[PDB]
Design a protein around this ligand. Structure first.
Ligand SMILES: [Hg+2]
Length: 159
C-alpha cells in the first residue's frame, strides 16, 4: 500500500514527525520493501533513535529479518549505533541472531571496532563462541581487523 511505502521512506529519511502521523493514519508498521526491509531496519540503519523508539512503541517486530538474514540489531551493530542497540536489546531482540553468512551482532561489532557495543552485547548474553560460515568467531574477526582491545576483551570473556 501507499502508507506502508511512505512509512519506509519516512523512516529512511529520519522524518520523525512524518512517521508519527503515518502511524496515526494506520500505516502498516511492519511493511516490507523489495528486499524485506522494514521501517525498523531503516531507522536502525540510519541511526534515528527516536524513530526506532516510536516504531517499537507501535508494535514493530524487533526481530524481523530481510533477505540477507539481517535484523535491526545487525544493522545497529554494523554502523556502531550504540544507543539504538541498547534499545533494541531492551525490547527483546535476539542478541545472537544469525544472518545469511552466519554473522551475529557480536561478529559485526567486533569486526568494525565498536568496543562499547561489544560490551553491551556481552552483557545481554552474546555468544563469544559463535562461528560464521567461515568458522570465524567474533574474536577471530577482531584480530583480523586489527582491533586488539576488543579482541582482548572477548578473550577474557570466554574464560
Ligand atoms: Hg514513528
Amino acid at each position: 500500500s501507499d502508507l506502508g511505502r511512505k512509512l519506509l521512506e519516512a523512516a529512511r529519511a529520519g522524518q520523525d514527525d512524518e512517521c508519527r502521523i503515518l502511524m496515526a493514519n494506520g500505516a502498516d508498521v511492519n511493511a516490507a520493501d523489495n528486499t524485506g526491509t522494514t521501517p525498523l531496519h531503516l531507522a536502525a540503519y540510519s541511526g534515528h533513535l527516536e524513530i526506532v523508539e516510536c516504531l517499537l512503541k507501535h508494535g514493530a517486530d524487533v526481530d524481523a529479518s530481510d533477505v540477507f538474514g539481517y535484523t535491526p540489531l545487525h544493522l545497529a551493530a554494523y554502523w556502531g549505533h550504540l544507543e539504538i542497540v541498547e534499545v533494541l536489546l531492551k525490547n527483546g531482540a535476539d542478541v545472537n541472531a544469525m544472518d545469511s553468512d552466519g554473522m551475529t551482532p557480536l561478529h559485526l561489532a567486533a569486526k568494525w571496532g565498536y568496543l562499547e557495543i561489544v560490551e553491551v552485547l556481552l552483557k545481554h548474553g552474546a555468544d563469544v563462541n559463535a562461528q560464521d560460515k567461515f568458522g570465524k568467531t567474533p574474536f577471530d574477526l577482531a584480530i583480523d581487523n586489527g582491533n586488539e582491545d576488543i579482541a582482548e576483551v572477548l578473550q577474557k570473556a570466554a574464560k
